[PDB]
């Protein structure tokens, strides 16, 4: 090998990864708990809820789209809009702890070349935990941005609002059980994009 | 010796990633609020519904993350006003989140009234010294 | 002695305390006084705190970080970091004829009017602190720019931290 | 020592979940589990889901009760 | 298709009597009781449940709440304007 | 695994700082579950101005360290002074004094939800001997709260 | 017949969420992320891809590019007028 | 020694992938793999193709994912 | 196997050449991420002619070795002189000087993408003392850039 004149263990990585993942998860949980009020101020799901306690839908946007289907034919588009999730009734608003909180369980289940490979696994577990936290941040950012995009398109008159019908009943029931004021609420029209471009409203900001 | 002025404490990459997400959230909200303000210009202010008077100028710093009624009752009791509730409270509670520092009770009541939105309203009668919370005619 | 909140805006008698405590030598105290009252010692003290000094030609410039010399998101002056402000006054006392320009700069986060108002408020606060220590009002002018002409990149954390500053220029 | 530099513990008031010292001062110690604690850090995985689904697995995967897979408790 | 009105077991939950055939759960960190009958929790407390979401709810005359919800080992509550957590064991 | 007490709190420490504050001269009183801290204005401010002395921050740190030992929802800070020129000047002075005191207390880490501030001027005196200025016993700042559970 | 418009996974690639059922790839030498789902690479970046050739493409509002292409262990990119290479592992 | 003749390493800024010294100067060392490197020489065969097709062969031939045969990795 | 730093660069080397250039007399300044090198015209050129001396190539080699330490996109070279005969002759002189300096810098191996050259004549002086010729402090060549990432 080299020139002509020049020609003429694996368990340490596993235990280092399994320790470093939990250690980095605990430090990430502590850093998340240090900034609890700022996260509530930033990801305010409560004030985006509609009139009848309905969570707004999630919209996705794409710009300047090209597809090469095969030879001799291509398809291009200027903008595209998609409805990723649909509106529904809720009783509680979402919180950032369902998205960002990482899982910690303390592991109590345990020399010439041992230390370097233990160190390499120790860095690998930290990298894995950072990747998991990055994916969680991307997910919560996607959901919040979709709700903001729906609130913008409602003012821009491209989506339809949901429609709520309520039926009022009087004093119902038999002689063994009564209910005083029954009210049944049902949404009849889901939000949807419109294709009538002549009814859209533009916005010019001075 | 060569130095540059801002030398702070060492930072964490989790906080770096959270800040990078928060900047994009913030200017998305800025663009959407600008578009919303351009489309719908408001014409009325709640100064008429909530006016100020004497002993509404005592100040408060509040960090509250619960329902509206107990906080409004505490503000009224500190302002030495009677408290009145109109309408039926909904089964799903009306939640508010206030985090301010050293502002007047009239401004506190106005921010609570604005954050309540379409669910509840705040009225102040200074001649009778009454703070009133009314629930919406919905459900 | 010395009162920590700005010494009641009085000129401090720093030399007589040192030459009175270094006697039980007078020549040694005079040597120490003429060393510590020099301009280079003041510049190196401002180097020990986080204030940068740039001299080029006949124009001198001081760079002061708002993140340490102001309270957070306020035009209030941080009273803990008073030796840096006293050293700024001591350095500016050496030029009694020049004119002073003070400018405020922030980063890119926020609205345009918010950035302009915060920069203007910080510039007025620093100009008022300069005016209250003896400098006449006709030699002062304050201006607050937003993220107009930055010195670092706003897409990175340390570069965005370096952009929030107060600039003091004189001839 | 809960009621230190006082007369010692009188009794556990379970209505408030706190000890009462031999003076009229409430103690800082808890004596029931139904006391107001400022709990902000909880251990265990499949939190903010339905919890750990109790099946025994040939692999090291941990699945929550809502179908989610917990990568942190999963063995590599 | 009229939806069902409620669950009448929440009246017994409001009164404090456990459902028949259920088992008890241990709740720590606050004043709350919980039972598990058909892979659902029934919670009796006077706090406000914030994060996990409930299916049905009733209220008594003196201000006690009764909830029907799915099982979870953690609850997020507001006490007096302050947000904290309750731990649920025995699931 | 569960906590055994309120964190950073001790009854012996509470008794120790109550005794130390009563020996220094700051009046600490407890009736039922209500707690009162009364501070003379001369130990905090200058002669009838809303400017804190530099040496009063140690006393404010001691008051904050005493206040961190309890659980509470609302604190009230009320200021009283004496007659100097008119009523508007003394009401504005008392409001500014209460604002500065509560600003430093909120800057320190007290775990309260609401802090209310008011300045009553010279409407409610506690002593009929009104010959002094800020050295009078009825020129003071009062901090009231109720211990929760 | 009309050709298909696009692939709707590129919206999630633009937002940064990986497609379901995919596995991660390690990218070195620059700021890019890659995933492999159905023997195709999905790349989220803000650089300009020059050599290997992509099948579908979308762009976000802030200048982020998402590409659908075939698998390859190397990418050629233009950074600021300079041509360099990115290394892709885990294939 | 990365921050030599300076005050030492402050922290790794992952937004730029660079170390920060204890002065205000950026360091020349990398601290993440997602840093701008001027990579011009990469090893491995079946480059500029789909990569090495993972079949095990009786002979020493190496085939790429596009049907090409790599004569450099192919054994004689 | 991956590189651990940018090749051929060291922070100690950067500090060493900055200190050596500042002790020699060439002004090196850094504010934020912007870098400025200010060179007197007497150390490079002859008496008001666009002809380099033979001994200034060592200084130009030192400046090139300092410039190879960073990563950058654009360099700006600007020339300033004093009033000799007219304005056209001094703009032509400054443009020729900037052209020669940037030509030798581009001949050496700086890894930049664009180098801009301009000569401003005597429009922007930094010193009101204008008695000298090429010995004046306001006759200079300036090299400015921004460090990238």
Automatic annotation (TrEMBL), chain A:
Protein name: DotC
Keywords carried by this UniProt record: Signal
UniProt superkingdom: Bacteria
Keyword Signal: yes
Signal as UniProt keyword: yes
From TrEMBL, chain B:
Xref: Pfam families: DotD
Designated name of the protein: DotD
Organism: Legionella pneumophila
Highest rank taxon of the organism: Bacteria
Keywords from the UniProt entry: Lipoprotein, Signal
UniProtKB/TrEMBL annotation, chain C:
Signal sequence segment: none
Domain of life the protein comes from: Bacteria
Annotated keywords: Membrane, Transmembrane, Transmembrane helix
Keyword Membrane annotated: yes
Gene Ontology CC annotations of this record: membrane
Keyword Transmembrane attributed: yes
Segments forming domain OmpA-like: 57-171
Protein name, UniProt field: Outer membrane protein, OmpA family protein
Source organism: Legionella pneumophila subsp. pneumophila (strain Philadelphia 1 / ATCC 33152 / DSM 7513)
Automatic annotation (TrEMBL), chains F, I:
Keywords recorded for this protein, A-Z: Membrane
One Gene Ontology cellular component: membrane
Residues of the OmpA-like domain: 32-149
Name under which the protein is recorded: LphA (DotK)
Gene: lphA
Whole sequence portion shown: 40 to 188 of 189
């Amino acid at each position: 090998t080299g020139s002509l004149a020049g020609l003429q263990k694996e368990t340490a990585l596993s235990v280092g990864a399994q320790a470093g993942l939990a250690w980095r998860a605990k430090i990430i949980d502590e850093q998340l708990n240090k900034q609890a009020r700022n996260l509530d101020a930033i990801y305010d799901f409560n004030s985006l809820v509609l009139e009848h306690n309905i969570l707004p839908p999630v919209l996705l946007e794409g710009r300047n789209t090209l597809n090469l289907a095969d030879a001799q034919s291509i398809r291009i588009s200027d903008r595209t809009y998609k409805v990723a999730k649909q509106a529904h009734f809720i009783t509680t608003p979402p919180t950032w702890r369902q998205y960002l909180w990482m899982d910690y369980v303390k592991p109590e289940a345990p020399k010439e070349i041992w230390c370097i490979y233990t160190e390499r696994g120790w860095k690998n577990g930290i990298d894995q935990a950072n990747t998991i936290l990055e994916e969680n941040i991307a997910r919560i950012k996607e959901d919040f941005g979709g709700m903001i995009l729906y609130r913008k398109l409602l003012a821009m008159n491209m989506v339809s609002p949901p429609y709520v019908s309520h039926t009022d009943l009087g004093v119902t029931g038999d002689g063994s059980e009564i209910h005083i004021d029954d009210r049944v609420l049902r949404i009849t029209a889901l939000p949807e994009l419109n294709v009538n471009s002549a009814e859209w409203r533009a916005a010019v900001a001075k | 010796k060569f130095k540059k002025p801002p030398i702070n404490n060492p930072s964490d990459d989790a906080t770096i990633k959270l800040a990078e997400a928060a900047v994009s959230v913030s200017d998305s909200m800025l663009e959407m609020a600008k578009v919303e303000k351009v489309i719908t210009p408001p014409s009325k202010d709640n100064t008429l519904t909530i006016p100020n008077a004497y002993n509404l100028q005592a100040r408060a710093s509040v960090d509250w993350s619960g329902p509206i009624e107990e906080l409004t009752a505490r503000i009224a009791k500190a302002a030495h006003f009677r408290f009145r509730v109109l309408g039926k409270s909904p089964s799903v509670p009306v939640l508010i989140s206030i985090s301010t520092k050293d502002e007047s009770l009239a401004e506190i009541l106005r921010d609570i009234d604005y954050q309540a939105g379409k669910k509840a309203s705040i009225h102040v009668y200074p001649n009778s010294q009454v703070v009133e919370l009314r629930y919406a005619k919905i459900y | 002695c010395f009162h920590p909140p700005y010494n009641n805006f009085q000129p401090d008698r720093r030399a007589v305390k040192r030459v009175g405590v270094d006697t039980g030598g007078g020549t040694v105290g005079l040597v120490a006084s003429i060393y510590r009252d020099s301009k280079r010692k003041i510049i190196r003290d401002l180097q020990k705190q986080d204030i940068q000094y740039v001299e080029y030609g006949d124009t001198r410039t001081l760079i002061i970080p708002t993140d340490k010399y102001f309270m957070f998101s306020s035009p209030r002056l941080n009273e803990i970091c008073y030796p840096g402000l006293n050293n700024v006054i001591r350095l500016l006392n050496f030029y009694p004829q020049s004119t002073i320009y003070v400018a405020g700069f922030t980063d890119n986060v926020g609205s345009r009017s918010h950035k302009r108002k915060l920069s203007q408020a910080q510039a007025e606060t620093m100009m008022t602190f300069l005016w209250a220590n003896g400098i006449a009002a006709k030699r002062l002018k304050a201006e607050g720019y937003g993220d107009k002409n930055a010195i670092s990149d706003n897409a990175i954390i340390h570069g965005s931290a370096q952009n929030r500053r107060i600039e003091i220029q004189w001839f | 020592g809960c009621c230190s530099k006082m007369g010692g513990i009188n009794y556990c008031d379970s209505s408030a979940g706190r000890l009462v010292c031999n003076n009229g001062f409430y103690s800082t110690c808890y004596c029931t589990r139904h006391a107001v604690m400022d709990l902000q850090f909880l251990m265990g995985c499949c939190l903010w889901h339905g919890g750990v689904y109790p099946q025994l697995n040939s692999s090291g995967l941990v699945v929550c009760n809502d179908g989610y897979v917990s990568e942190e408790c999963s063995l590599q | 298709g009229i939806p069902p009105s409620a669950n009448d077991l929440l009246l017994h939950v409001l009164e404090g009597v456990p459902p028949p055939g259920s088992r008890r759960l241990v709740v720590s960190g606050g004043d709350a009781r919980a039972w598990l009958s058909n892979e659902k929790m029934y919670v009796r407390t006077n706090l406000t449940i914030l994060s996990p979401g409930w299916l049905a709810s009733m209220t008594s005359a003196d201000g006690t709440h009764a909830y029907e919800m799915q099982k979870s080992p953690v609850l997020l509550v507001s006490w007096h304007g302050k947000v904290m957590q309750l731990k649920v064991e025995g699931l | 695994k569960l906590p055994c007490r309120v964190d950073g709190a001790c009854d012996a420490t509470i008794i120790k700082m109550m005794t130390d504050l009563n020996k220094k001269g700051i009046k600490v009183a407890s009736v039922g579950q209500n707690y009162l801290i009364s501070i003379p204005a001369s130990a905090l401010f200058a002669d009838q101005s809303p400017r804190l002395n530099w040496a009063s921050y140690s006393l404010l740190n001691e008051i904050a360290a005493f206040l961190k030992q309890f659980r509470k929802i609302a604190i009230t800070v009320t200021s009283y002074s004496s007659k100097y020129v008119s009523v508007k000047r003394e009401r504005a002075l008392t409001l500014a004094r209460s604002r500065v005191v509560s600003e430093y207390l909120w800057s320190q880490g007290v775990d309260s939800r609401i802090i209310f501030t008011q300045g009553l001027g010279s409407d409610k005196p506690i002593t009929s001997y009104t010959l002094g200025g800020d050295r009078s016993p009825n020129a003071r700042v009062e901090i009231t709260f109720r211990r929760a559970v």
